[PDB]
Design a protein around this nucleic acid. Structure first.
Lengths: 228, 143, 228, 143, 228, 143
RNA sequence: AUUUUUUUUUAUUAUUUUUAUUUUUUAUUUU
């Protein structure tokens, strides 16, 4: 099952690159028609990370968080390598991770965003406009010497097109990811200054193109054994 | 025929050979945009008093505030709005009493006008090195 | 909990951009229907800063200010990094800051203001009017050569729509922010010449759409230990 | 058929090619507004005595007070109120005894009339460069 | 029968080589005109492995996978060496393998990919550009110390040219491989970070230059005896 | 005639003989690109304050962050965009008040400009060893 | 009087947190 999402912004979307100095917008290149061009786009891993935070927040609303032991790392303790918990816990089975050195396999594959005028996304909603138009707001000038800052951002009206995909149409994980995308369509955000109103978007989910998930299935109430 | 007053600027520094080509704009499209951008920004430093805030160097009106203001004005379309934003921003003066500069400028304010903004964005300080060198040399020949 | 506020101006709202020369109004762009437009709007960080000043003023009415040691900066002294004071002090927990290099996390997220005719805010109260109408008063001409000044401002009748949000419906901080918005609805202001009557507005707070704060809770009388 | 007296103004400076298009207003909407604004403001400098305060240059009635007064009048709607505010502001004269200028002007005072104010705001000094060049050239051919 | 495929990328194609440190792109050398040069190219075995995974996934949609006993190895048990199953099972007959020490013979031979400007592929679609242009995106910086990572990749617009070949125009195996290439042209991928959108391509299959496969033949419904 | 201020840099370390040839660039084409790259990157370490993050070694502004930033800027074309990306990245300063350095730099920013990027990619740290040695030696003669 | 055969470098990781364009200025006077 793949999900096609169209995302229309409602504010500026600041996405940082990798004395009163500016700091740019992340830009990736394309060779569309024989020449090299730079275009702005949020990296596809940022969307995956936002969905990861949303999924971990949603899986704690029905499971207790009073006890522990996100972005996992690798370290060996005793190499315990039985992984039935993918069936038990529907979060690390979908999005992957690293527990004890042996990294996991994630069913989810998600693509980058493409706001600008190119030929790489799916079908366009409008006749095009020019490419170099990502004009920049000017920042807040701390004013305890008021050091003038300035950031670079997409304008508030740009449309974005993205698709995510789960290949194995097997079990409740499709409904779990549908709930995650419902939350992200309801009150999602992506950007870098969400505490200042930068990054408010409204999305729509469409085009479940393969064998659909059955209505009213279980999300996580599987008696909550709450293992490690 | 005409001295074309943006040519007698560049004539003061022969140690920097030209950018475009030997004798005419052939074989490159971005070089024309870069030359137009350099000429346009060169007809912006000698169009004002140096009337701004005063210290014995005039605070490098040159990398202290000129690239910031030029960049900030470079986020509008297409070229007339850009020059309005700049001239209302930095100091404010159309041109001195030299009608050749005025006619050359007003000829320049329109072009293809799409790649010029891209040139002002993706390579700012090389053009500032150029303008600083020509300004310093033509000042040095009137010392 | 999110708070939806409608703000009707009662005077001009001057909000500066970033010899007898003018000085404009801050304008941010939108791509609404395929073309680029400039519209005036107060940046969303200005609203956050005004609320920050209001909150710091309100937290000093019950806590003594005779001793010290706002807009915080970052500098390291010894990197003391225990942060229980978020529970003790309800001001820096909500609005964030930087104490000793490690910046804080702010629960508050607030959006920009949208006065003009667009499609980005919530539901409109009136049939629309034209966009380029932000006519300008002319300033005061010092008259010790009387140098004529001139500023650019919104007219006195423009409505504005804004929403603020606290995500974690946990504790007294919702009531504290409700008190802050009560103060701002009572005698708030936003603008750039409040000493000359520019920026007087009247607001209303509405639409606590999630689990509401219980009536009569403690604001700050938690025995005032008054630590650093 | 008619000389259209705003055409014989622009005919004195062929070194500046036209703004709109080759032979007719096609393919651009803001160019029509810009041309209408330039023609309107051009029929405002030759409509007065230069009756204002007198020094041997008449204080650049041209960037000393004309852009300020035009901008100040440009904060009203739609176009008739704008021209009233300007003509009561600057000097005050409808048109000389040339009925072609008067009829062309009164034809011009109404249009779409929304984007013209936007053109007077977002690009003032380019139009002033244009009007200064045409005025200087048509003065130079009567010297 | 040989199949000529042209592959246009739709995203970055990361293909790894063999503290905040980078990690490069695989590069193979050419002596084109007397001098040694390094050019990036995906190894031809990677394409074969991707097709192997696609074929094994496709052969399990019509054959049950509830019982077992891919990348095979060699080990002897009793050396049972009758191999009629090549006619029965159309997967290991085409792509080869090792069952009990005696490795198999694969009919498929597939060539490497050649994206860059050289003289080794078949006919070019465009006038050329420079060679050293494989600019690199910068990675995700884990942010639990946010360790900045960086990978090196081809840009999203590079074309690629490849040919595969089955020599023995005999039986249904040509139709089976045609189905495999149809799947790979539909929703194929090649690269190293497909979970982050890296490696999405669109291909076209062309130029069956020898005796063609007859329409509507049997793929695998040969009564499914399902032997070892 | 001129001291050519990138020559008086290399003159402080005679224990490292030159790379190109005995007395002139003959018999090798990649050596010219390597020398141009070394001279360009040498006119980048003495063009800034060492204004960056401060510890008693300034965090090796030298293999801690200089090769990373130079490599990251080396993924653009051709050379002006590269230097813009670098100068906006690392610290930001055109050149000090020494017009010889400025003129030599702005002469250098254009060349064949294709193999220079290849030289910055396929051999980075040898050039960094060179620049570190010359910088350390010319610092040592002013101790 | 072939050293031939078979053998994806691959799973996993937000460039995130913090930040008022602020404070000051009778369109005065003269018939």
């Amino acid at each position: 099952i793949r999900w096609d999402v169209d995302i229309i912004a409602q504010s500026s979307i600041v996405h940082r690159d990798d004395d009163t100095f500016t700091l740019f917008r992340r830009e990736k290149i394309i060779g569309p028609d024989g020449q090299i061009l730079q275009i702005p786009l949020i990296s596809g891993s940022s969307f995956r990370g936002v969905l990861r935070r949303v999924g971990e927040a949603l899986t704690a609303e029905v499971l207790g968080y009073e006890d522990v032991a996100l972005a996992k790392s690798a370290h060996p303790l005793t190499d315990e390598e039985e992984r039935n918990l993918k069936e038990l816990l529907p979060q690390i089975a979908v999005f992957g991770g690293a527990a004890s050195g042996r990294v996991m396999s994630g069913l989810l594959s998600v693509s980058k965003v493409l706001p600008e005028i190119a030929e790489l996304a799916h079908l366009l909603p409008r006749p095009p406009h020019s490419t170099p138009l990502l004009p920049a707001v000017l920042s807040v000038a701390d004013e305890s010497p008021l050091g003038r800052f300035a950031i670079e951002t997409l304008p508030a009206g740009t449309r974005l097109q993205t698709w995510a995909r789960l290949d194995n149409a097997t079990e409740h994980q499709a409904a779990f990811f549908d709930n995650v995308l419902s939350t992200f369509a309801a009150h999602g955000h992506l950007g870098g200054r969400s505490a200042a109103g930068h990054g408010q978007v409204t999305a729509t989910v469409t085009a479940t193109a393969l064998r659909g998930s059955l209505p009213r299935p279980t999300v996580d109430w599987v008696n909550q054994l709450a293992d490690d | 025929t005409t001295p074309t007053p943006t040519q007698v600027w560049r004539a003061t520094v022969p140690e920097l050979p030209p950018l475009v080509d030997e004798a005419g704009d052939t074989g490159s499209a971005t070089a024309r945009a870069a030359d137009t951008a350099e000429r346009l920004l060169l007809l912006l430093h000698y169009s004002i008093d140096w009337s701004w805030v005063a210290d014995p160097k005039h605070r490098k009106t040159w990398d202290e505030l000129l690239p910031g203001r030029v960049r900030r004005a470079a986020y509008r379309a297409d070229t007339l709005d850009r020059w309005w934003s700049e001239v209302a921003g930095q100091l404010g003066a159309p041109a001195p009493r030299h009608r050749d500069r005025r006619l050359e400028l007003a000829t320049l304010l329109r072009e293809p006008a799409l790649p010029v903004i891209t040139v002002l964005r993706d390579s700012l300080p090389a053009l500032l090195l150029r303008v600083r060198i020509i300004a310093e040399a033509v000042a040095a020949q009137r010392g």
